[PDB]
Every structure is written in structure tokens, then in C-alpha cells.
């Protein structure tokens, strides 16, 4: 990814985007409690605890482009990737705009939650001033669209999160985009079919786990993931993207059906148009964090990008016996034989891409079922039924989730949830959380899950 062009919003006829100020992430009463590093991201220039500059900093993920075409390993791995994908008969039809806004198998309803985006951002207009959940309406929406149109401008937000003492220290905070509701739909509209698809298929033919269950799929990994473990990590994965990935992603869209018309939409992703505050900028390359189905194009692509490096390393390499499953940047692996990920990672770097150790190890040492994690969980086989396995949040980052929160008045579902992922680390474990949170008086107060009827309902759910 790269910025291309950068000016004053003001020069446009762009009005500044009024973005937050504070944090919503607040203290909560279980911050003395507990132990925890992490504190809210930077979110202004003038953060006390900046020791760098933050414009600079959350900018410098887009790192540039490795201009070049779709080589021949690139071909074969969206060949063999493509083919997988056709056991599923995606549906490139367009999915009819009821099913694509308010819900649907496969796809949640679109948030209405979330910003609308530009222009919707500026005039004062929220998405439920357009939407609503028990009417179901589409005329002010159709009303919008054809008002507006298509490929409009993206806001670009620093996400509010908690973040490590180096993060917030060196101001790395992440960006995300909001894009427009009028494109948030023609996308959903365009892909709604191949979302569903990925979010009922998780596994090794989608080679996808966006939209998984972890209580239920991380007994499935094992299963599906056979020989040897391959994974690492990236940095800054979304702006490292170069256009050739997407070029690629282009291809093995078209090899299932869709039309080059319809794969335009991924020249909008690829070739952005930004609004950050008082400042608009265009971008070439990188994934848009944020835009409508940016997490299933980015594990597609991932799909792409390892097949890639496989081919071009070890040449000779039979990817029929090759396994994997992306959520975004993060990635599991295997194959019948040892792999060296090093390797990899360089022919990697030569594509524009930062792989590193899984998990900042030192070295792209020996992954095992023992040390591995995918979406920060760890896998353990439950002692009794050794065919179950445990997705296992480490208790430190549920310590620090705990220690802060955007709204109190969610205490009872917030810790809910988190008893949902402790108990997985064990009885010992889950009995020191639940008397820590009854330390304070709002703990008692709470409806907790028993450690029994957790491991009750988890088995049954098989
Ligand atoms: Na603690
Ligand atoms: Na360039
Ligand atoms: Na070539
Ligand atoms: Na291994
Ligand atoms: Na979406
Ligand atoms: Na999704
Ligand atoms: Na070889
Ligand atoms: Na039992
Ligand atoms: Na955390």
C-alpha cells in the first residue's frame, strides 16, 4: 500500500471530519483487581504518552508497493486455490438487497451500529435514519443510493483500543475505514452469496475461519490440519498489500463466475480515496481495514500469497497435500512434510510482505499443537473426551480486557463473555477469576456462569 497523494481537506471542498478526542475505554471497577500492561490507543497528536509522532506513526504501515506483474507461481496458486473454491458453487448472483441489509443466513444484518460513512458522516445522518431493524424499509436507502451513488470517499477512524506500553509508546495506533452505506451495500449485494458461503464453511475448502465458532471449530483444526504445523505472523499485513495481490484476487474471482464488471468493486478497495480529519488522501494498494468483506478478501488472498510462496521456494511441492485456514493475516498450516517458514518469509519480503516468527519468537522454530495459536487461542485437548479441544485465551488477556471498559452499563454481558473464554484454562483457573470479580461489590451483583454448567453445555453442544 502507498499514498499517493495527500492535501488539506479544505482544498477539496471537503468538510474535517469530526472524529472523537477522548478514549471511550475508561477505568472499570475491576482495574485495581486485576494485573494488565495495556491501555487505550492513542488517539491525538498531543498524547502525554507519545514518544513519537503520531501522524507519522499511524501512517507508516504503508510501507509501498513491489510493483510487478502476476507472476507464474502466482498463477498456479490461484489456479489450485480456485479450484477448491468450486467445490462450494458459490452463487455469483447478487443477493437481493432485503437479504444483503437486514439479515439472512450466512450474514448478519449490516450494523447499525457503525458509521455511515461519507456523506452521511457530514450531514448529520446516521444509518438508523435511514434503516430500521422492525420495518425493514429499503426506500430511503434506494433513495440515498441512487442520490449519492457508488465509489465514494472512505472515513478513516483510529480504532479505540487497548493497545501494549510500546504500541501506545511509539503511537502505533491501527486505522480503520468506514465506508460509504451506499457502498457497504452494492457490496453486500455483489458478494453477499460468497460471504454466506465462507461464514457457513469455515475450514480448509474456504481455507477461511472468518465468522467460526471457536468452542466448536478448534476440535474440527486438528482434524483438518493433518501433518506437520506451518505458521507465522505478518506486520501490517492490510497496508503491506500491493496491487499484484489483488490483481490475483481479481483472477480467481472471475475463475468463479463473476464478471470483470462485478470485480470493479475490488479496484475500489485496492485504489482508495481517504478522508482522515481535515486531511484526504489517496492510496494505491493496500486492504481498507473496515470496508465490507475486507477480512474474507483478506484471508482469500492470503490463500493466494502462502500457495505463492510455497510454489516459488520449493519447487516440486504438491499443494494437494497442502492445508490451511486464514482469518485475515493469521494463518495455520500444514503439510505431510517439514517446511521451513524462514524461507518463506523471504520469498515473501520479495513480494512486498513482513512475515515474522509466530507469536514474536525468535526464530521460525518448531511449531507444535502445544506452542501454536490462531486468534490469540492456544489448542488443548480436553483430559476426558481427548476428540474435543479447547480454544484457550491466555488468562493475561483476559485480565486486560477485564481492567477497562467503553460502557458500565454492559458489566453483566461484558464479563459474561469473558467467563465464556477463562473457563476453557481450567477449574483452578476459572475459580480464582470468579473470586477476584466478587472482590469487588458490582461482582457479586453479577449472574456468573458455574465452571459445571460451562463444561456441561460445551460438551453438549458436540
Ligand atoms: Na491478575
Ligand atoms: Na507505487
Ligand atoms: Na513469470
Ligand atoms: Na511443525
Ligand atoms: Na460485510
Ligand atoms: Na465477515
Ligand atoms: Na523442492
Ligand atoms: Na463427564
Ligand atoms: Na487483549
Known amino acids: 500500500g502507498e499514498i499517493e497523494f495527500i492535501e ?35 488517539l491525538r497528536s498531543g498524547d502525554p504518552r507519545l514518544k513519537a509522532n503520531f501522524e507519522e506513526a499511524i501512517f507508516s504501515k504503508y510501507i509501498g508497493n513491489v510493483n510487478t506483474h502476476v507472476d507464474e507461481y502466482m498463477l498456479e496458486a490461484v489456479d489450485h486455490y480456485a479450484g477448491q473454491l468450486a467445490t462450494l458453487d458459490i452463487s455469483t448472483e447478487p443477493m437481493k438487497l432485503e437479504d444483503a441489509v437486514y439479515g439472512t443466513e450466512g450474514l448478519e444484518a449490516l450494523d447499525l451500529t457503525t458509521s455511515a460513512g461519507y456523506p452521511y458522516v457530514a450531514l448529520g445522518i446516521k444509518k438508523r435514519d435511514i434503516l430500521s431493524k422492525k420495518t425493514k424499509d429499503l426506500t430511503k436507502l434506494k433513495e440515498c443510493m441512487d442520490k449519492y451513488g457508488l465509489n465514494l470517499p472512505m472515513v478513516t477512524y483510529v480504532k479505540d483500543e487497548l493497545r501494549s506500553i510500546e504500541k501506545v509508546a511509539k503511537g502505533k495506533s491501527r486505522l480503520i475505514e468506514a465506508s460509504s452505506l451506499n457502498d457497504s451495500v452494492a457490496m453486500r449485494q455483489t458478494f453477499g452469496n460468497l460471504y454466506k458461503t465462507f461464514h457457513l464453511n469455515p475450514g480448509v475448502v474456504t481455507g477461511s475461519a472468518v465468522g467460526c465458532d471457536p468452542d466448536l471449530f478448534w476440535s474440527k483444526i486438528p482434524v483438518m490440519l493433518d501433518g506437520h504445523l506451518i505458521a507465522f505472523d ?55 481495514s473496515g470496508c465490507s468483506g475486507t477480512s474474507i478478501f483478506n484471508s482469500m488472498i492470503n490463500n493466494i500469497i502462502i500457495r505463492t510462496l510455497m510454489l516459488k521456494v520449493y519447487k516440486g511441492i504438491d499443494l494437494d497435500q497442502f492445508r490451511m485456514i486464514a482469518y485475515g493475516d493469521d494463518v495455520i498450516a500444514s503439510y505431510p512434510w517439514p517446511i521451513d517458514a524462514s524461507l ?34 492456544y489448542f488443548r485437548a480436553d483430559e476426558q473426551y481427548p476428540f474435543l479441544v479447547h480454544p484457550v485465551m491466555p488468562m493475561k488477556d483476559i485480565h486486560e480486557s477485564i481492567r477497562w471498559t467503553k460502557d458500565p452499563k454492559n458489566t453483566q454481558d461484558h464479563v459474561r463473555s469473558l467467563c465464556l473464554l477463562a473457563w476453557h484454562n481450567g477449574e483452578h483457573e476459572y475459580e480464582e477469576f470468579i473470586r477476584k470479580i466478587r472482590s469487588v461489590p458490582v461482582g457479586r451483583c453479577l449472574t456468573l456462569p458455574a465452571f459445571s454448567t460451562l463444561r456441561r453445555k460445551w460438551l453438549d453442544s458436540f
Open 234 to 288: 505478518y506486520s501490517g499485513y492490510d497496508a503491506s498489500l500491493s496491487p499484484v495481490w489483488f490483481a490475483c484476487l481479481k483472477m480467481i474471482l472471475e475463475k468463479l463466475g463473476y464478471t470483470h464488471k462485478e470485480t470493479n468493486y475490488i479496484d475500489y478497495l485496492c485504489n482508495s480515496h481517504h478522508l482522515y480529519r481535515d486531511k484526504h488522501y489517496f492510496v494505491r494498494g493496500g486492504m481498507p
Open 344 to 377: 518463506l518469509a523471504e520469498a515473501g519480503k520479495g513480494y512486498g510482505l513482513i512475515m515474522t516468527p509466530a507469536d514474536k519468537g525468535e526464530c521460525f522454530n518448531e511449531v507444535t499443537w502445544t506452542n501454536v495459536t490462531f486468534l490469540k487461542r
Open 8 to 42: 488539506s481537506s479544505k482544498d477539496a471542498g471537503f468538510p474535517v471530519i469530526n472524529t472523537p478526542s477522548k478514549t471511550k475505554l475508561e477505568p472499570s471497577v475491576f482495574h485495581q483487581v486485576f494485573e494488565g500492561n495495556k491501555e487505550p490507543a492513542v
